Structure formats: C-alpha cells, structure tokens
Symmetry: T
Subunit: 89 residues, 12 copies
Amino acid sequence: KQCSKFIVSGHVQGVGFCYHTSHQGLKLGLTGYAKNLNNGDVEVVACGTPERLEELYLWLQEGPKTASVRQVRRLSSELEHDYQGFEIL
Amino acid sequence: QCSKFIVSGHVQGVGFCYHTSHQGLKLGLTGYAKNLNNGDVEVVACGTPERLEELYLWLQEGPKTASVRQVRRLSSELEHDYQGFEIL
Amino acid sequence: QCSKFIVSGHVQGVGFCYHTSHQGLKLGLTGYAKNLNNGDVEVVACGTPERLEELYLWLQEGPKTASVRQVRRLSSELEHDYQGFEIL
Amino acid sequence: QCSKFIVSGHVQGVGFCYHTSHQGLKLGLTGYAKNLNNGDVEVVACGTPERLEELYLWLQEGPKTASVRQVRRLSSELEHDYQGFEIL
Amino acid sequence: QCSKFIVSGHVQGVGFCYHTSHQGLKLGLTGYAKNLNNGDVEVVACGTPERLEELYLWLQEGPKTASVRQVRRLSSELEHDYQGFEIL
Amino acid sequence: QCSKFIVSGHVQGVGFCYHTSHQGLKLGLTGYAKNLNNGDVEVVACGTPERLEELYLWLQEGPKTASVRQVRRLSSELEHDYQGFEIL
Amino acid sequence: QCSKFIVSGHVQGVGFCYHTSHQGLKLGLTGYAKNLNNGDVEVVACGTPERLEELYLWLQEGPKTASVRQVRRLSSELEHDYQGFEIL
Amino acid sequence: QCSKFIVSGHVQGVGFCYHTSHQGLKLGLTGYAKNLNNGDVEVVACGTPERLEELYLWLQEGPKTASVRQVRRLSSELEHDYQGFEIL
Amino acid sequence: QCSKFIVSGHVQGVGFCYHTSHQGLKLGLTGYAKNLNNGDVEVVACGTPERLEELYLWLQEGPKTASVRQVRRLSSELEHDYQGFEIL
Amino acid sequence: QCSKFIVSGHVQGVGFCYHTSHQGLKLGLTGYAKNLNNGDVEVVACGTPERLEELYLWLQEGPKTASVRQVRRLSSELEHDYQGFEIL
Amino acid sequence: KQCSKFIVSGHVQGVGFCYHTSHQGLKLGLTGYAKNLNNGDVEVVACGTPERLEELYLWLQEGPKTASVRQVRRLSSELEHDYQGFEIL
Amino acid sequence: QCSKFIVSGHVQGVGFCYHTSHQGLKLGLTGYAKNLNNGDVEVVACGTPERLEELYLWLQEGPKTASVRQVRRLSSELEHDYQGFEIL
C-alpha cells in the first residue's frame, strides 16, 4: 500500500478526464482523487499497490481517452491516508 | 450547446441508459437519458459539438448490449446547464 | 391554486430559473421552473392568486439577468402540493 | 408488463398519488403516479399482469379519498426498472 | 387550514405516530405527529376542513394499535406549508 | 425483545416485504425483512411480545398479496436497537 | 450574541421565514425562523450585535411580502452554533 | 424507559451536547441533547434504568469541558423510540 | 431470473466488485457483488437469462484487474428487485 | 470560460460568501467562494464574459454587508464544469 | 495491512458496544464493521496493521466498556477488501 | 479565534484525523484536520482561545495512536464559520 501523485497537463479539464481517471482507478482497485488546478492541469492522486500505480501511470500516459495529454509528471508522496473511493475535486 | 437524440430499437432494459451516460461523462458531456413511453430512449447531451458528434456516432455504431435500430438527432434550442448525466 | 407560465426569450442559462425560484420562495409560493427544449422556461407556481399576480408581473418587467420577451399565462387545474421551488 | 393509466376527476391533493403508490408497493409493483396539468393523474405501474390487473381494479373500485370519474388504460412499451413508486 | 390535536392515552411507541402520519397522507394532508414528555401525542394536520374532520374522527374510533382515551381539538392559527407528515 | 420469522411460499416479488414492514410500523415494532436466496423471506421484529403475536399471526392469516405457505418462529437472542423496518 | 424575536401579524406562509433566513445569511447570521401555533414567527439569530441590529430593523421596516404588526426583541442566553438559518 | 435532565451551568458551546451524546451512545442509550433559550441543555435519554443512572452520574461528575452547576432530573414518562442520540 | 455466482481467486481489493458492478449495470442487470471471508466474491445478478449469460461469461473471460481462478454458478430462487448494483 | 478573484477586506463571517454565491446563481454563473487562511475570499466564477464583468463589478461596488477593500482578477485557465456555486 | 475477525459474546448488544467498538477502532486507524448476530454475539471485522489489530484485540478483551464481555475468539480472515470507515451492521 | 496547526510525525493512517476531530468536537470547537502531501496533518480549529489551548495541548501531549513529533502553531485570519469537525 502506497500513494503516488501525478500532474497531468494539456487539454485535460472539461473533456471527461477527471471522470475517466476516477473510473479507471476504481477498476484497478485504486482510491484517490482527480483535482482541477487553476493553471489548466489536473492533479491526480491515487493509492494502491505499486504495480497498480504503474498501470494507472501507464493509462495516464498512453491510454485511450478524450483528453489531449501533453505530459504526466510523477511526484513523490508521503501521504498514507485512507481515501474514500476515487473523487472528482 | 445541447442536442437531442431519439434512439429506437431494443433500447429499454439493456443498460442502454447507464451505458449512454457512462459514455457521455467520459466525453465531458452533461445531459440525460430518459425512458419514453413508446419504447424509445431520449438522450439530451450538452458539450462542445465535436464531442456531441462523437456521442452521436457511439449511439449509432458503438459497442453496446442494446439493439439499436435508429438514431434521429432532433434539433432544438435548450441552453440550460445540466447537472451530470442522469437516467430519468 | 396554481398557474402555468410560458416564459420565452433569452431565458435559459442566464440565472432565470434560480432567480425565479428564489423570487417565488419570497412570495411564499411553491412550484417549479423547468427548462424546455424550444428555449422557453415553463414556470408553474402555486399560492394565493395575489402572489401569483406579483410573480406574473415579476416574470415580465422585474429586474433579472434574463432578456424576457413574452410571458403567456396558461390555465391550469392543478391541486398538488409542490415542495419548494425546484429547477426542472 | 408495464401499464399506463390516466385517472381523472377529483384526484389531486387528496392523497391519491400517495395511496396509489402505497397500494402498488403492497402488490409488489414499481412505477410512478404523476400529477398532470389538466387535473388528471398519470400512474405507470410495472409487474405481473395479474397485479397490474389488481391495481386497475383498485384504481376503479378501491376505497379511497379521491373521487375517480374515469380510469382509462393506455398502452405502454416501457421496458424499464423503476425504482420505487414515486410521486411526481 | 390547520388544526391541532392533543391525543392522550397509551399512544407512544405503539405505532400510533407512524400510523397517523400514514392515515393522514392518504387523506392528502400535511403536518406532523410529535411525542410529548407527558405521554401524549401532538398531531398537527393541515388540509381542507372535511379531511380534517375525517382525521379527527380517525383519531377517536379508528382501528389502530394504540388505546386512545381522549382527543382535545385545539385552535391553531398556523398557515405554514408542512412538507409531508413527519414524526416528531 | 426480538423474534425471528422464516416465511416461505410465494413471498418474494409480491410486495410482501414492504407490506410486512408496513404492518410492523403500524404495531409499533422495529425490524427488517430480508430476502433470502432459497426464496424465503427472513423477518426479524422487536417489541412488546403481545405485538409480536399480532405480527406472527398477521404473517399467517393476514390479508396479503403473497401466498404464505409456512411461517417459522425461530429463537432469537438479539437485543440490538433496529432502525425503522428495513427491507433487505 | 444571539437574540430571540417574536414577529406577529400576517407572517406565516407568506415567504417570511424564507425571506428572513435569506436576509440573515446575507448578513452573516445563523439561526432559524420557526412557525408558531398562535400564528407568530420565532426568529432567533446569532452574530455580531450590529448585524443583529441590522436584522432587527429589516424585521421591522424591511421590504417583504408579509404584513408585520409587531417585532419584540426577547433576549436569549444561548451559545449553540446553529449551522444555517433553518425554517421550522 | 425514558428520563429527562435539565443541566444548568456553562453548558452551551462547550461540546456539552456532542459529549453527552457520545457518552450516551456508549452506554446504549437513545435520545437528544437540546440547547434551551435560558442557557441550559435539556437531555432526554432512554435505556435500562441502571444505564440512565450511569449517565446521570456522568452528567454530574463526569469529566468534561463544560462547567456544570446543577443537574436536575425531571418526570420520566414518554415512551417513544428515539433514533440516535441527536443534537438540537 | 436472479443467478448467484461464487467467484474465487485474487478477487478482493482489486477493483473487481466495482468493475463487476459496472458490467452488470452495462448489461441492464441489477444486483450486488459482496466480499466474503474466505477471499471469495459472491456476485448476485438478476436480469434476462441471456444478459445473465453475458455476465457469467465476463466473470470468466472478460478483461479485468483480478486473477479469477474459478467461477461457479450456484442456483438461486430469489425473485427480488435489487436496487442498482451495489458492493458489500 | 472561467475567472479568479481574490477579494480582501472585512469579507469573512460577514455573509460575503453566501451573498456572492447568490449574485452568482442569479447571473447564471457557476463556481465557488473559498475562505482563505490569510483572511481573503477566493471566488471562482464561470460563464459568458459579460456576466463575469457583472460579477466582477458587483464584487467591487455591489451593495453588500462585507467591507471590501480590494478585488484582484487572476488568470484562471480552467474549463472545469463546477456544480452549484459552492461555499468553501 | 490485513483484516481479522473476532466473535465477541456475552451481554453485548443494546449496551452501546457496537458503537464503542466502531469508535475505538476509528481511533486506532482501523476500518471494518461490528455486526449484531442472532445468537446474541457480536461479529467484529477490522482492517489495518497487525499491531493495530492487537490493540483492538486487547481493547475488546480488557478495555473499559459498558458491555459484559465473556469471550473473544479471534478468527482467520482472507478478505482484503477496502471497507469504508467502521460501520454498525 | 481560528487557529491553524501543522502536526508532523507518523500521523496519517493512524486514526489521528478522526481522533483530533473528536477531541475538538468534545471541546465545543469546529474546524478540520486535513492530510497534506508531505506527511503532515494541518488541523484548523475555531473556538474560544482557551478551548483552542486545550486542543493545542492535547495535540502535543494527549494520549493518541499517532507518533507526534512536532506541533507548530501558525497564522491565522480565518474568521469563517466551520461546519462540524471534518477530515480532508
């Protein structure tokens, strides 16, 4: 059990993205949230096992989705909180 | 803008609504999928046009459990802001 | 004690429904304000005929963001208790 | 296995929708009873046709507060799980 | 209009509140049924007076679990829309 | 005090659970009606023992839509404060 | 810093409770407006005493639908953080 | 059985109601801790008596944030089932 | 028309219950996927036999996070209207 | 399209957030007003740029309880659909 | 991270126990449920680190609580489901 | 009278947030304890200076599951009303 943070940028809000991401997590058994940042980015935080975070990291990059994902930056995270489901904002 | 879709076929009771709304929330669309009495499903959807085109094309060709016979996009001029994508 | 109102004009997405629902909750009225596919807003409101007149007036010339062109009062024989003043 | 009904007379604000849902839910049915502008009540039940018959009969002869002049069955090709027995 | 009722006897925790709220919703009434620290139940119900008479009768001789001993109709000049028929 | 009731017959799908939970709430009881896999309906109900005989009897001969074939009184040593009368 | 007010006149079912709570929340205040049997409205606010004076005045002179005969400040010794500005 | 407790002191705004209901729920009690206008807190509690004693004892002596001055128990009777232990 | 399925393997905490729920919802079904002590999921779906077949297939073969070992079909008699598609 | 506003002054606790969300929902906007640790209130508002200039105006000159010193317009590049006009 | 199950028996329902337990668990960072069984017992399932499951196990035993706890029997559990908070029933 | 508090150590996933929120509710306070990315909890509480003091104390020396290292007091100018005691 471990949580990662990711900062996705590009055409990423308003294009079903925080939903798809949410949904895609829950499907991988993850918990977290996708939050809409003011710059235009989406900050996604998920927690599960590391290979389930890889799969999401992989989805976040190349996955089939409406959004035009220009970059995903993984960030180190020390939060070990039990998030409920996978929430938007 | 908002578009309206009459779907006719074997559309009620086959997860059609759930699926349609799933598909829409994934495109960034807002609207509803209402069960009509005749047997059709009405689908109202708002987003950017190219997105509603996507949705329209799914309603027609998209892989689903339902047996879609026709997809008529009716015109009309609603400019309300819908909540999510609900099933009425 | 309910009346039906068919507000036409630039009335969707321009706070008209939140605003109307508020203005009628202040008159002690109940009912709804539902958005219609042609671009109109169907406002149904229940109360004493006098508060109805205040509200009919308010729909026309009151201050509001919306550009209201025409308000057509319609008859209604409707005796159900509406809880609050919902949107749609 | 979903029927439409139009009930007419003195039938709104007289508990009718509510009692109707209650009678339906006892029969094991799901659907709604909606208040219509003209005064009439659109009740849509769903279940086994005998139960749907049972509700037709209650809609006609059943001890109730409302004064029911006419109950007209209409046809429905609604093929949909309705949650409870809503009032609308 | 609204009336207030002060039901006394073995009338608490014996279904009486649920029952009255049910029975009142079937007459198309609104209001409440509140448990009082002396053991009585306060029933406020709002409707047409004839329905209120029906309910007033119901409280007395109606079939119901509770052993009612006395019902003292009070004045009440309250004109507030009560949503449904609550408990407490 | 609480009791356990295993009812069998034509009891699922036929509004039995709601109707039971209704009768319960009318006699002042608290409990649940759980739909079992075998096709039986497990009813747990709590209150004064006399009221539990009324329910145990209504479970047998009480007018209802379900076709009750057998009612099985099981020994329960539970003492939990149950919410309303939930359908499970 | 919580006052109690008893407002009297034609004040119930005339949007007064609702307009009051709105005016309150605009002012920064928390409390309720409760409908009383005799007819009067029990408004209880909580804030800084200026905002409390502002509301006093609004209750008296404020443009509103109701006809306010009397407003009697009535002194409270209560601290409890009321969450919103409820209607009761 | 239910009991009533008027607690006077520095009891409002000091977690007294929260803490009281926390303590009750831990003893298996149901009821409510209502802030009164004078400044006291009413506490209605139901359970086995030996539990109401415990609460009464905690109410008086129990470690808390509030500054209790007098703990009067009043007339028991009142035989309702309260949902949880609430705060109002 | 309600089939029960005991799914086994690495099937808890892997999104399977969510996922299974989304698939049954996509096929027009209602039911639940509950997590069992042994490590297993019991999924209970109710729809048409063919829709129940698509699902039994998916549980087996469908793309999913989990590592299914074995899906057994157990027999059921439950004829109850499950709400949506929950997770327990 | 969206915009960002940092309002500073005597703006917290004086009903500013509410009143802002009210003007907001009146102009048809969506967004939020978030109370900041520094003492300023961050308002985000989404809609037609003319309605934004209306809100931006009202944030300065608008009749309100708050004592507004300065209103800073920031770059918001946002695009997210916001629900109501929430208070954070 | 893991789950255990405990069957606590004695005078255990109607005496604030399922509330206290839920509460005690939540304070230990655990999630699970306290379920009222028909026999008179209380089934408690809780999830977290094993030293946090000890603390609850130890609580359940000697901890000060209204109930009259006669026996606590720990049972083996293979469930690894994310439970939301700590629920009663 | 709204203090902010950055707590650190092994303080996430250890029931701290729940527990802090319960201590603060016991002290008659409102506010939140939110989990931060670095590992830290930021607890924001609002009440009377001394109540904010017992909390500051408890945060440090109070019995709790967590391993607190350092508690810093910070800021603040929040003059906002916070609901209950949340977790973020």
